[PDB]
């Protein structure tokens, strides 16, 4: 529990790791890997309202949790080159399991006002859709 490898929020998973080294018998140590999953028991499959029942199957692949794609800088000889860090994040299309506390989610519903119908917008997480 010391160094954070990933803290992902679309799937809400967190993975840390730590080397704890014995001094006697220097040929064998132990390397620890901790995983924490939080399962939402009341979310839908797609995130809109009328979609489908409760999501009842939750699938986590380690190679898609730890995936890192925002570019980086490498200095080769005397040059700064921009490199990518992953093979697989072609643009979204990822299915998220939870909401994210700093992004806000809306829906569109038709209602009537005597004559014709409008295109009323509706907040789904009200703490984060405040316009300011």
């Amino acid at each position: 529990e010391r160094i954070v490898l990933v803290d992902n929020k679309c799937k809400c998973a967190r993975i840390t790791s730590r080397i704890i080294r014995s001094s006697e018998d220097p040929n064998e140590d132990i390397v620890e890997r901790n995983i924490r999953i939080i399962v939402p028991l009341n979310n839908r499959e797609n995130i809109s309202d009328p979609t489908s029942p409760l999501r009842t199957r939750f699938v986590y692949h380690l190679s898609d949790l730890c995936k890192k794609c925002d570019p980086t800088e490498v200095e080769l000889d005397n040059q700064i080159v921009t490199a990518t860090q992953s093979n697989i994040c072609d643009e979204a299309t990822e299915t998220c399991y939870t909401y994210d506390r700093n992004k806000c989610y809306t829906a569109v519903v038709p209602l009537v006002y005597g004559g014709e119908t409008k295109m009323v917008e509706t907040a789904l997480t009200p703490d984060a859709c405040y316009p300011d």
Binding site: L5, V6, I15, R33, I35, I37, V39, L41, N42, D49, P50, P53, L54, T56, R57, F58, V59, Y60, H61, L62, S63, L65, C66, K68, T106, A107, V109, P110, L111, V112, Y113, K118, V120, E121, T122, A123, L124, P126, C129, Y130, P131
Partner: protein, 231 residues
Amino acid sequence: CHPRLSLHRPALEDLLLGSEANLTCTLTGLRDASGATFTWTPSSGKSAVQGPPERDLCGCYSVSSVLPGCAQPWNHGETFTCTAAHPELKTPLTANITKSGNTFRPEVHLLPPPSEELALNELVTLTCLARGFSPKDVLVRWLQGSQELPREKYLTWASRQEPSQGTTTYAVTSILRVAAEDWKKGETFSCMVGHEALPLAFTQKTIDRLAGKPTHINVSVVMAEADGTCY
């Protein structure tokens, strides 16, 4: 008997789902008619038309007025004033109004049917409660699937003041009765609440047969390659 002048907030259904926004200012106690023409301190088109008066206990006249176009002053925080000149008083009477502050936003809950109604297999009922909001104007509408039900299918009570735990807040309820076959086919119904304090003026909650008293919790978690060179 003696006259008394009152002022009236714009209707909630016209500010949220509408275009126009009329204020209105009435005065009771008028004898037959008068030459009262009202005064309004922002006067950009003060089409203050009155029309035919209404009759009261034992026969009396009460005349009012309107003023159009009140979205941006009312929401930006302007102020308004209404006053008229009339015989049966010493001084002409005045009134003022302002959009309220120190508000709270409602907490919406949608409750599943009771377990006893499900066995009889005629109809079920779904309860929609909104709680803890500071001005006392709300709107309740229902949907089935994604299509809005007409107003005559359900029943909504009025907003009332609940016992005090600090600041003064309000509440409301509503019920809808739907066929007990559609509850087991797997349709969804959802409740919408519109209020001044919410961010985008509406919010919603949804319920169907699986979410809400399920008697069954099934969950599968699959973690694929835990020893898997994570980078």
